[PDB]
Design a protein around this ligand. Structure first.
Ligand SMILES: Nc1nc2c(ncn2[C@@H]2O[C@H](COP(=O)(O)OP(=O)(O)OP(=O)(O)O)[C@@H](O)[C@H]2O)c(=O)[nH]1
Ligand SMILES: [Mg+2]
Lengths: 151, 309, 164
C-alpha cells in the first residue's frame, strides 16, 4: 500500500526517508528530488491530495503531503488508498511523535531519527499500517524503551 | 597490555557517532563529499575492529549515509554481525540498517536465515517483532519460504503484538509465495477471528490486498467481509473493507446490491467526514453498477448529494 | 578468542557447539546461515563461529576469515564417502593467506558408528602431517557422548594463550 515515506526540509535535504517497494539507491534519490519538486513548489492553500510520481512506477499512485515551517511530510502510497484516511494516519502519527519526544522538533529528526524510525515502524511496516491506537503505540514505544533501559 | 586497551578507549572517545557525523556534515557542508569519504574510511576501519558497540555506531552512521544515499552494501556482512549481537540494543540498529540497505540479489539473502529463525524463536517479543520488521522491509523468496514454517506459528503467539506483526509480514511472504497462501488461507481466515481487534485488522488488510490481487478468493468470503465490517468499529478498517468492495462490486453486482443498505445505514451513522466521503464515493460506484434495472437509485443518489453538499 | 569453526554438512558442528555451551545434545536442522556463541574455557573466552557445512554455503566461507584466530574442522568419520570433499575443502581453506597465522584443531566426530575411522587415518587422508608452518593437532571426538571435547579445548587454549 504505502510505497515510501519521505521527510525533508524546504531545500530538499532529507529528514526521514523510508521505502517499502523495492527501488535502487539512485532511483530512491531521484524519487526524493521528484517529490521535492512536486510538493515543495505547491502553495499552502493547494490541496494536499496530489497525484503520484512517475519514477515510483506510475502516476496512478498518490503523494499525500502536509508541510509546516520548512518541513514537508509526504507518504508515497498507491492508488487504491484513502487519501483522507492517509491524512488522518499522518496526523495521528505526528501526535504520537509529540507524545514520545515531548514536542518533537527538527533537532529530533536530525539526532534522534533512529527513534523516529522506530515510531514509524511501530506505525507502519512494508506499506502496512500496524497501529492506529495512539495510546497503544506509545505504550509499545515506552515498553521498548523500558526494555532497552533495563538491559 | 592494559594501557593499549586504555589507548583504544581514548580513541573511541575521539571517535564520532551518528550525531557527531551529522554535526560534522553540518559544519562541513562545503567539504561534504570529502568529509563523508573520510568518515566512510573510518567506518571501514572501525568495522575491521571487534568492538560490537563501535561497529554498531558505525552501522548507525552507515544507515544515515544510506539515507543520504551512499553505497554501504560492502559492509552487509558487518551489518549481519551487528544484527547477530547478543545485545538487542545493537540488533535494532542492525535490523534498521538491513531494512533499508539489503537487497535480494546479494548473499545476505542466504547467510542470515539462522538469526531470523533464532530471533523469531526467541521468546522475548521485542526482538522477534524487530526481526519481523527487518524481514518485512528485507525478505527474499528463499527466506520467506524457509521462514513461513515458523511465522505461521508466530501468528499463534501469546502476545498480540507478534501476531499482528506476523500477519503483516506474512502478507509479503504470500506476495513471494502463494504456495504458502494455499495452506495458510484458512489460517488467515482463522486469524481474522482473533479476539484482539488489532490482529483482526492485520488479517483484514492482508486479505483485502490478497483479494485485490486475486479476485478469485473473495466470493465465498463476501459474507465474512460483511460480518467483518459490522463487527468492525475502527475507521481505517472500515475504509479498507469499503474500498475492497469498491474493487469487488463491478465483479459481483449482487454483492453491492446487498451491501448498499448497511452502507446507507453507516452513512447515517458516520460522523467522520473522511469516512463520509469514502462511503459516498463507494456507494456512487455501487449505484452506477446497479442502475440497470433498479429504479430507486435516485433516492440514494439524492442522499449522496445532500452529503456532498 | 575469535574462532572460525567449519566442516561439512551433517558433520556435527552445531551439535558440538551447543554441547560446549550447555552440556546437552540438541536436535539439529541444516545450518543454512551460521551461528555465533562465545565459549569460556580454562578462564579464556573463545568466540567460536559455526558456519554452515552445506556445499551451497561453502562459497560464502570467505567472509568470516577476518580477524579469525583459530580454525576447527569437524570430521565425520562415519561419512567415509565424503572424506575427499573434506580434504579438498580443507586444502582450499588453508590456501588462503588470511588464515596463515591462525591455529587449527581437528575434531574427528561420529565415533559411535562402528564404521568410524581412527584419527590417525584422518590425519593421513587430510594430510595434516604435510602441513608446514602450522601448529596443528587431531583427536577422536564424539558429539552425542561428548568424548574428546575438553582436551581439544585445552589444546586450543594452550596455543592461543601466552600465560596461565
Ligand atoms: N552418531 C553420531 N552422530 C552425531 C555426532 N555428532 C553429531 N551427530 C549427528 O549428525 C547430524 C548432523 O549434526 P549437525 O550438528 O546438525 O551437523 P552440522 O555440521 O552442524 O551440519 P550443517 O548445519 O549443515 O553445517 C545430527 O543428526 C547429529 O545428531 C556424533 O558424534 N555421533
Ligand atoms: Mg549446523
Amino acid at each position: 500500500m504505502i510505497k515510501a515515506i519521505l521527510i525533508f526540509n524546504n531545500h530538499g535535504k532529507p529528514r526521514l526517508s523510508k521505502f517499502y517497494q523495492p527501488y535502487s539507491e539512485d532511483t530512491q534519490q531521484q524519487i526524493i528530488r521528484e517529490t521535492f519538486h512536486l510538493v515543495s513548489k505547491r502553495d499552502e492553500n493547494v490541496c494536499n491530495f496530489l497525484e503520484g510520481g512517475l519514477l515510483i512506477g506510475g502516476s496512478d499512485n498518490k503523494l499525500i503531503y502536509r508541510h509546516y515551517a520548512t518541513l514537508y511530510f509526504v507518504f508515497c502510497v498507491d492508488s487504491s488508498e484513502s487519501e483522507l484516511g492517509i491524512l488522518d494516519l499522518i496526523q495521528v502519527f505526528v501526535e504520537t511523535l509529540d507524545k514520545c519526544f515531548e514536542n518533537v522538533c527538527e533537532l529530533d529528526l536530525i539526532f534522534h531519527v533512529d527513534k523516529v524510525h522506530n515510531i514509524l515502524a511501530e506505525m507502519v511496516m512494508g506499506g502496512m499500517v500496524l497501529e492506529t491506537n495512539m495510546n497503544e503505540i506509545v505504550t509499545q514505544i515506552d515498553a521498548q524503551n523500558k526494555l532497552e533501559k533495563s538491559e | 597490555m592494559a594501557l593499549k586497551m586504555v589507548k583504544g578507549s581514548i580513541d573511541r572517545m575521539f571517535d564520532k557517532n551518528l550525531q557527531d557525523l551529522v554535526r560534522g556534515i553540518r559544519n562541513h557542508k562545503e567539504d561534504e563529499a570529502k568529509y563523508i569519504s573520510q568518515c566512510i574510511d573510518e567506518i571501514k576501519q572501525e568495522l575491521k575492529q571487534d568492538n560490537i558497540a563501535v561497529k554498531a555506531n558505525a552501522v548507525c552512521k552507515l544507515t544515515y549515509l544510506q539515507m543520504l544515499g551512499y553505497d554501504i552494501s560492502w559492509a552487509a556482512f558487518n551489518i549481519i554481525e551487528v544484527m547477530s549481537a547478543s545485545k538487542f540494543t545493537f540488533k535494532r540498529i542492525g535490523y534498521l540498517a538491513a531494512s533499508q540497505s539489503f537487497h535480494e540479489g546479494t548473499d545476505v539473502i542466504m547467510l542470515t536465515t539462522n538469526q531470523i529463525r533464532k530471533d523469531l524463536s526467541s521468546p522475548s517479543q521485542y526482538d522477534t517483532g524487530v526481526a519481523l520488521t527487518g524481514l518485512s522491509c528485507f525478505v527474499t523468496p528463499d527466506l520467506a519460504r524457509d521462514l513461513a514454517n515458523d511465522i505461521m506459528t508466530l501468528m499463534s503467539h501469546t502476545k498480540p503484538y507478534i501476531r499482528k506483526k506476523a500477519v503483516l509480514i506474512m502478507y509479503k511472504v504470500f506476495l513471494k509465495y502463494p504456495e504458502s497462501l494455499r495452506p495458510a488461507f484458512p489460517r488467515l481466515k482463522e486469524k481474522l477471528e482473533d479476539p484482539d481487534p488489532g490482529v483482526q485488522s492485520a488479517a483484514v488488510n492482508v486479505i483485502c490486498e490478497l483479494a485485490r490481487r486475486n479476485p478469485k478468493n473473495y466470493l465465498s468470503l463476501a459474507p465474512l467481509f460483511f460480518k467483518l465490517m459490522t463487527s468492525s468499529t475502527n475507521n481505517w478498517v472500515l475504509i479498507k473493507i469499503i474500498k475492497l468492495f469498491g474493487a469487488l462490486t463491478p465483479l459481483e453486482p449482487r454483492l453491492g446490491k446487498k451491501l448498499i443498505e448497511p452502507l446507507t445505514n453507516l452513512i447515517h451513522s458516520t460522523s467522520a467526514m473522511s469516512l463520509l466521503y469514502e462511503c459516498v464515493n463507494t456507494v456512487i460506484a455501487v449505484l452506477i453498477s446497479l442502475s440497470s434495472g433498479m429504479p430507486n437509485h435516485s433516492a440514494s443518489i439524492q442522499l449522496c448529494v445532500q452529503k456532498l453538499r | 578468542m575469535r574462532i572460525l569453526m567449519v566442516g561439512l554438512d551433517a558433520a556435527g558442528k552445531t551439535t558440538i557447539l551447543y554441547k560446549l555451551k550447555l552440556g546437552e545434545i540438541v536436535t539439529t536442522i541444516p545450518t543454512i546461515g551460521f551461528n555465533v556463541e562465545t565459549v569460556e574455557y580454562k578462564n579464556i573466552s573463545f568466540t567460536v563461529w559455526d558456519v554452515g557445512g552445506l556445499d551451497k554455503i561453502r562459497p560464502l566461507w570467505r567472509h568470516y576469515f577476518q580477524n579469525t584466530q583459530g580454525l576447527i574442522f569437524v570430521v565425520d568419520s562415519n561419512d567415509r564417502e565424503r572424506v575427499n570433499e573434506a580434504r579438498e575443502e580443507l586444502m582450499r581453506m588453508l590456501a588462503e593467506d588470511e588464515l596463515r597465522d591462525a591455529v587449527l584443531l581437528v575434531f574427528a566426530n561420529k565415533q559411535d558408528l562402528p564404521n568410524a575411522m581412527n584419527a590417525a587415518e584422518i590425519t593421513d587422508k587430510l594430510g595434516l602431517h604435510s602441513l608446514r608452518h602450522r601448529n596443528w593437532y587431531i583427536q577422536a571426538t564424539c558429539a552425542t557422548s561428548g568424548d574428546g571435547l575438553y582436551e581439544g579445548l585445552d589444546w586450543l587454549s594452550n596455543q592461543l594463550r601466552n600465560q596461565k
